Amino acid sequence: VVQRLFQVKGRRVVRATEVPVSWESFNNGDCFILDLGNNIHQWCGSNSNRYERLKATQVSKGIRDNERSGRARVHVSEEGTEPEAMLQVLGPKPALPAGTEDTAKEDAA
Numbered sequence: 001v002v003q004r005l006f007q008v009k010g011r012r013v014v015r016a017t018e019v020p021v022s023w024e025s026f027n028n029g030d031c032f033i034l035d036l037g038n039n040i041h042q043w044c045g046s047n048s049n050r051y052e053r054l055k056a057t058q059v060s061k062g063i064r065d066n067e068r069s070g071r072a073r074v075h076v077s078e079e080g081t082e083p084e085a086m087l088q089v090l091g092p093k094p095a096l097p098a099g100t101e102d103t104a105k106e107d108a109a
């Protein structure tokens with residue numbers, strides 16, 4: 001059973017990092033990829049930036065094309081439009097926190 005969650009965060013340096021499969025991983029300032037195998041859920045918070053939304057597409061389509069040999073379908077959603085399939089895995093959505101600053105220019109990135 002494939003269930004993975006990626007946090008997609010940054011501005012000039014955007015990274016996708018695997019995090020625990022939980023609503024507690026989400027915030028409204030980043031994008032998240034909930035990978036369910038033959039379906040990949042691309043979710044972006046209201047305060048996600050354009051570079052995160054772009055990279056979320058690259059990651060979801062890269063899983064689809066490179067890991068799943070094109071077989072999977074990517075579905076785009078946002079807060080309040082989550083597909084039933086997402087809620088079946090994560091449970092009902094709680095109130096979500098804000099993100100943190102994306103730029104960390106002096107820190108190893």
Ligand SMILES: [Ca+2]
Nearest residue numbers: 029030099102
């Ligand atoms: Ca962000």
